[PDB]
């Protein structure tokens, strides 16, 4: 299990910019512009444009509030008039340079519209968002705009009994089948297009009730799925339906410890400036006995692609003679491959679209959407497993250290408004710091990263507002030792400026900078006076930031024992000399000790010169 966050930053001790509109709640949708300087917020009954560099600067505002006759219609359907019967923005996507595509629950009448960016006024397109947007603010939902066409995963109805992964195309509308083999009680988590003869694919991530597994209760299972951008459906069968829909198990577990995380919470696509293949960073929690635990598994796209392209499918079979069981299909697979895209191979066999695929192949995919092979993580284990924390959303920044060693920086939000910064150091997790983003411990519902030159920020939304944080707080570190010991690839010590700087931001010289991810503060170069009355009591204040260090006191060059009657420890860090007399005068030193590898790192926290009067 991952250790405790090395340093805890109170909302008070760091520079965090906040945004909220009075009487406006549920800041669940976040979208930043092309230029990255304008962040758009989708809340309950409102859409805003804020300066992404200072979220507190409100630029534009637009509302989409529900009428009383629509609220009462919703309430008459036994829903909560002042809770669920309101317009929760669920779809906030780029449409053009001059517009956004917006959908809201709208007292259970999913409605879509175009937000005119030049005016920040809605165009009144008033489209029926049934299938595109959920009815209930409680229902799961995911959407990705690909080539001005919305690819959405949510419920097709009011009750949330009909799930749907569909494309609102207008030219070629396509949707999933309303069948258990296709989708079995899913809870949508994330979707994105993975761009390139070879066609683009639109991946979907969700948790659904498993068909392959049987246990005491119904077992959930994380799913990775994909569809082909060029899909047009089948001609005779799969009319207006996906022909390219294949899914597989997403497995996040440490078995030598019986830890299985079968509930997917978030998915982030690490788009490597260097690496040609994207890495999905997926966030999971266990369905069973969650108390709570969180795990972060990283999946190489190539792995998943290997399953969808060459993996054996699963067959459903009748078993004695009213039951259905699912097993590996070892029978003959049709050609062209069921679920495959219109690639170079297909085009050679005179196949231009799904509309001209053989009925043999189309029937196969319709009856075999599920793959036998699981999609496994890189190094076949989670990147991080944490206890006593319920992680909510994830973002990852691939950063180059001073050394040139590349670290994948994990920003993980909690259900209590906190953000953890973690890196997988040499075969062990290091949680650099934790920051309390929300003073009200509101769970971070959404998280969004901008790693772009200048505007390097993380944006977190909750029901109470939005928070803007940098990727590091290098300046909070006082000494070179403190700067190095942090083991943050973002932070380096600058001897000329006598400040711990943010490497890859500051205008300090690279060649003349200090950073050691080993934590060996050895690479570094290197008195509060008091006058108290006789008989009186002294409180010598001492504090440090490491949650992984312990402090001890020293008087007259010896390790002082804070025991009654002469001594006491107030708050485990502040020394208390009780009965002051001639001999108590002199130097009192507060020291810290923290283990890095095998070695211990002692640091002098406080220096005190106590003088007792006569």
């Amino acid at each position: 299990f991952a250790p405790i966050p090395r340093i805890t930053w109170e909302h008070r001790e760091v520079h965090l910019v906040q945004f909220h509109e009075p009487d406006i709640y549920n800041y669940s949708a976040l979208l930043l512009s092309e230029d990255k300087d304008t962040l758009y917020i989708g809340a309950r009954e409102a859409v805003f444009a804020v300066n992404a560099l200072n979220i507190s600067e409100k630029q534009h505002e637009v509302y989409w509030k529900v009428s009383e006759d629509k609220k009462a219609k919703c309430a008459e359907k036994g829903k909560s008039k002042q809770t669920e019967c309101l317009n929760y923005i669920r779809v906030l996507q780029p449409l053009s340079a001059t517009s956004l595509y917006v959908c809201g629950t709208n007292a259970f009448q999913p409605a879509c519209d175009h937000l005119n960016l030049t005016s920040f006024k809605f165009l009144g397109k008033n489209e029926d968002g049934k299938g595109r947007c959920p009815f209930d603010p409680a229902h799961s939902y995911t959407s990705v705009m690909v080539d001005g066409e919305l690819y959405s995963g949510t419920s097709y109805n009011f009750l949330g009994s009909e799930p749907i992964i569909s494309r609102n195309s207008s030219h070629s509308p396509l949707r999933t089948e309303y069948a258990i083999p296709w989708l079995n009680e899913p809870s949508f988590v994330f979707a994105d297009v993975i761009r390139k003869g070879e066609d683009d694919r639109v991946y979907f991530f969700f948790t659904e009730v498993s068909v392959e597994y049987e246990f005491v209760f119904r077992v959930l299972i994380p799913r990775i799925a994909r569809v082909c951008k060029g899909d047009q459906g089948g001609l005779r069968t799969l009319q207006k339906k996906w022909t390219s829909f294949l899914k597989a198990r997403l497995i996040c577990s440490r078995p030598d410890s019986g830890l299985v995380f079968n509930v997917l919470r978030d998915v982030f696509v690490l788009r490597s400036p260097g690496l040609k293949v994207p890495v999905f960073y997926a966030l999971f929690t266990p369905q069973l006995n969650n108390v709570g635990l969180s795990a972060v598994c990283a999946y190489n796209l190539s792995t998943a692609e290997e399953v969808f392209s060459h993996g054996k499918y699963m067959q459903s079979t009748t078993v004695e003679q009213s039951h259905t069981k699912w097993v590996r299909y070892n029978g003959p697979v049709p050609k062209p491959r069921p679920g495959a895209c219109i690639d170079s191979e297909a085009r050679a066999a005179n196949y231009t679209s799904s509309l001209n695929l053989p009925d043999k192949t189309l029937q196969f995919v319709k009856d075999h959407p599920l793959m036998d092979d699981s999609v496994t993580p890189i190094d076949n284990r989670p990147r991080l497993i944490k206890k006593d924390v319920n992680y909510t959303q994830i973002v990852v920044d691939r950063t180059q250290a001073l050394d040139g060693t590349v670290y994948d920086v994990m920003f993980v939000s909690t259900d209590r408004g906190a953000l953890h910064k973690a890196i997988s150091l040499e075969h062990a997790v290091h949680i650099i710091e934790e920051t309390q983003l929300f003073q009200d411990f509101e769970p971070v519902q959404t998280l969004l990263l901008s790693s772009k030159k200048g505007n390097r920020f993380v944006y977190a939304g909750s029901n109470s507002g939005v928070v803007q944080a940098p990727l590091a707080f290098c300046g909070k570190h006082g000494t070179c030792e403190d700067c190095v010991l942090a083991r943050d690839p973002y932070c380096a010590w600058s001897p000329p400026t006598a400040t711990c700087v943010a490497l890859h931001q500051t205008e300090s010289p690279s060649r003349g900078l200090i950073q050691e991810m080993s934590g060996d503060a050895s690479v570094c170069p290197d008195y509060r006076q008091h006058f108290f009355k006789h008989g009186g009591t002294a409180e010598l204040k001492c504090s440090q930031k490491s949650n992984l260090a312990r402090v001890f006191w020293k008087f007259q060059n010896g390790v002082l024992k804070a025991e009654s009657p002469k001594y006491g420890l107030m708050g485990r860090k502040n020394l208390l000399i009780f009965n002051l007399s001639e001999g108590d005068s002199g130097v009192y030193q507060c020291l810290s000790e923290e283990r890095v590898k095998n070695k211990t790192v002692f640091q002098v926290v406080a220096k005190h010169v106590l003088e007792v009067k006569v």
């Binding site: 008459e76 036994g78 829903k79 259970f108 009750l159 009994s161 258990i180 009680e185």
Partner: protein, 124 residues
């Protein structure tokens, strides 16, 4: 149904089962004719709807009379009373598909021990 025009009573021939759902053949199997007045049919379906809509399929006093069939991710509800009159044929917000726990019971009018009934026509 009774015809001379179209009655209000459903006459249904039933046969006892053999060990796909074949009726036990020859003298080992028997048949019966049961009458289920369609108002009795509607009374029960209406009370199955009413329970499932307003009182969680429980129906006072006691209880567990309606549920959602075919494993559909729906449940019975505690909807306003007005739902019954407002939505007789249901809506996007009402539980579906509903089914009764309580069966519609009929005692035979005909009980033939060695015969396997295949067709019914009734007149008056």
């Amino acid at each position: 149904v009774a015809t001379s025009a179209h009655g209000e009573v459903l006459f249904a021939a039933f046969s006892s089962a053999a060990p796909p759902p074949s009726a036990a053949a020859g003298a080992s199997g028997a048949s019966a004719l049961c009458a289920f007045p369609l108002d009795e049919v509607d009374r029960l379906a209406n009370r199955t709807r009413d329970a499932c809509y307003t009182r969680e399929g429980r129906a006072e006093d006691g209880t567990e009379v309606a549920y959602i069939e075919y494993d559909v991710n729906s449940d019975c509800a505690q909807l306003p009373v007005d739902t019954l009159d407002a939505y007789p044929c249901g809506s996007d917000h009402t539980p579906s598909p509903m089914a009764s726990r309580v069966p519609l019971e009929a005692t035979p009018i005909l009980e033939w021990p060695g015969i396997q009934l295949t067709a019914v026509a009734v007149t008056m």
